[PDB]
Point group: C2
């Protein structure tokens, strides 16, 4: 049971800052917490950082850690049934950085069960049959994936063609052929040998108790396996690749089962600066309603048609989760027809189209939280991109006050055109199971050695900091 009656709403201190602040920082600690204002709730929601370098280095050890988390969160759920049944949810989630931890819920037993979870995942024991059955279950799950939907597997190539490295399912499939339990079983404390944990906290709790809870969990883990602090010289992030400034490249993927031919486009404006956010979103909104009016509705190229944003490596962009049975080059020509449509529509965006358009994106943008976790996921998105300007949305409003009609001339010429000298266009064909003005397009290449493809190209700058 563990006493949930301690629900008295804590009044905010003299330290009244409008956001979670870096209230505790050491070589191990980095602590972030503001409490409830719009809700005044007994719950609290929690967001927790894990990093290991080993979580990006091997398909073998990734499968290891993946199934490790599987049998692990599998285990204490027999305990945690009643507690989360007592309205105390939590999350263990694989990332490319490592795992992901997040806890939500009432202030019944939060530091206590918190500590129980920390100790439990800190020291855990393994059964060989349960090991091998979990192994075989996800083994049969692996080769299930080889026939996904073209838009789903297209999203896989989306996550695959926008990174530093991502190991394939074939990389995983040869890798499970040699897996033993003593291997990862010895490897796990080597796996967890050095970490930094950043803690995002929120709700009906105390600053000084949050300091003690942070010191608690770090001292607990040092007690377990003496996980030493990480290095700033090894906390690395990975970049998105630079095109040869007009070279747009593409390749094809003949599907096996589905006779629809998939294709999806992507672009690179710049970082989330003042200008480019509203550029991409407002542009996304002006390819929402007239394009939904025209291409999907008026042309009916196919059933699966999408047009929307795509944020990779802390860089936004523009995706089109569109699937039909067309010649994809012909469908590109349709796309180019839509680009000429937008060419005519630059001046044809009137005063009213602009005003309704900016106010609808503003209402899209402006939204107070309805949950204590609603803003927290978005804050977590700033966290995983290391941003922390929690009023950069106010900066977004200030730039939404700043776009002119002349800007989209400026945005089109060097960025959006075909003769665009700063053109960063991406497309990929995903072919089938069997598969009014034509501009002078430069013939793109075929992409065979993806290793040699992404081998020689540059990358993108990080932040002049805030």
């Amino acid at each position: 049971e563990f006493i949930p009656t301690n629900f008295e709403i804590l009044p905010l201190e003299k330290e009244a800052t409008p956001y979670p602040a870096l209230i505790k920082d050491t070589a191990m600690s980095k602590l972030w917490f503001k409490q409830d204002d719009k809700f005044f709730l007994p719950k609290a929601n929690l967001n927790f950082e894990f990093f290991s370098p080993f979580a990006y280095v091997d398909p073998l050890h990734s499968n290891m850690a993946y199934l490790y988390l599987e049998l692990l969160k599998d285990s204490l759920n027999e305990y945690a049934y009643a507690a989360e049944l007592a309205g105390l949810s939590y999350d263990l989630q694989n990332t490319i950085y490592g795992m992901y931890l997040s806890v939500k819920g009432y202030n019944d037993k939060q530091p206590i069960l918190l500590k129980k979870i920390i100790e439990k995942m800190a020291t855990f024991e393994i059964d060989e049959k349960r090991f091998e059955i979990i192994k075989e279950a996800y083994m049969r799950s692996l080769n299930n994936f080889r026939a996904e939907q073209p838009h789903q597997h297209a999203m896989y190539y989306l996550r695959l063609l926008m990174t530093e490295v991502a190991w394939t399912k074939d990389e995983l499939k040869e890798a499970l052929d040699d897996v033993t339990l003593p291997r990862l079983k010895a490897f796990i404390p080597q796996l967890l040998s050095r970490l930094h944990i950043e803690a995002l906290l929120h709700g009906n709790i105390t600053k000084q108790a949050a300091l003690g809870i942070m010191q608690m969990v770090e001292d607990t883990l040092i007690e377990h396996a003496h996980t030493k602090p990480l290095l700033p010289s090894q906390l690395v992030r990975y970049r998105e690749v630079q095109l040869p400034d007009r070279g747009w490249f593409v390749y094809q993927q003949r599907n096996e089962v589905h006779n629809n031919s998939g294709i999806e486009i992507y672009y690179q404006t710049d970082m989330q600066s003042t200008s480019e956010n509203m550029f991409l979103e407002l542009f996304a909104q002006i390819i929402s309603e007239p394009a939904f009016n025209t291409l999907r509705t008026k042309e009916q190229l196919g059933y699966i048609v999408f047009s929307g944003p795509r944020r990779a490596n802390g860089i936004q962009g523009l995706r089109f989760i569109i699937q039909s049975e067309k010649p994809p080059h012909y469908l590109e020509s349709r796309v180019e027809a839509f680009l000429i449509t937008m060419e005519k529509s630059i001046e044809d965006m009137t005063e009213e189209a602009f005003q309704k358009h900016i106010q609808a994106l503003a209402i899209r943008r402006l939204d107070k939280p309805k949950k204590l976790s609603a803003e927290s996921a978005k804050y977590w998105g700033e966290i995983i991109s290391q941003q922390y300007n929690f009023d950069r949305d106010n900066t977004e409003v200030a730039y939404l006050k700043t776009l002119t009609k002349e800007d989209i001339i400026k945005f089109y010429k060097e960025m959006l055109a075909v003769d665009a000298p700063r053109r960063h266009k991406v497309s990929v064909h995903v072919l089938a199971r069997e598969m009014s003005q034509a501009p002078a397009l430069p013939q793109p290449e075929v992409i065979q050695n993806m290793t040699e493809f992404k081998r020689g190209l540059p990358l993108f700058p990080l932040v002049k900091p805030h």
Copy 2:
């Protein structure tokens, strides 16, 4: 166990190429192969790299690999005194990519002896305390490493700020406390289950016998520890993007030596035939007026030197200068010599131009002397994966294309004070006692990176 007896030399067959040829490539093996046409000597020298992803793992894994090879080469040396007594030598050396193997001497019984070497380093037992003495010895060595020369530490800067990532000696310092013997003793089969060996063979040697020898050796390797191959993207490579005009520097005061170190670096590019003769000719064309005035006339310190950088398949420009001076003061002197060459090259007429490009030619022009020197240049061809064995005549013919105006084109685009390709950067070292660089984290925080070189 071995004496060389094959000295009746084997004549050169149908293969009419004068170079190391890639005759075999599997998922594990890749055999660039040559036979002897110059000197007809019964020695055969061997070159083998041991790439591993486990290279950049830790400063702990650095010392693992390092001290592993160290004691490892020390251990079989107890076996290898008959070979040392035979005068038939070898090499084991680490890389920031992995390890390196050389085998040298006569072509008779190198495969079988080599197989013994491979088998013993694969099946190797570990002594506890002997290792501890070695551990403490390299500990005291790293303790001594903080008291080394600023020019030696300047070359350490050359390996330092010119990568994607490295480890520091302080990182190396605390991690020696973390060393246990079962850690690496269990990490060796962790190590040896996946790494790479590219094969290079050269000598009075046949083809199919060499195929069988290399296949035998890798078969033994897979027999013991089952070394599974890599992905080609798993052979990835480590350099800092510039703003291309802004000049950057930091100081790191010395502890022991009272002299101050300084150097200004300039990356041009890859080793394109353009940038090769740019760098070489420009470096040597400033070298002799430097010998005229800065070294001889000024006499600031004795350790004053200028040279090129050739690493990562990437060119560079160095100035080995160690002397206790005020920093900006010596900066202004080097700047003054930049002005000196700016006028002096324009002052150099066609005569010294032609004699000096002839000097660079005869620098470049030298006949083979042994397999070792050509093989060292071959190894440089290997490590950046370029193999251009006939860039000699090519870069010479390119050298003929450079005029007095052509080098001015090389000046003002890149080397002017307002040049947009001003690749200017420095590192200060103080005594034993623009803008500033905040952090090395800030040094590698906000950056693009480079296109990579097409391999061969």
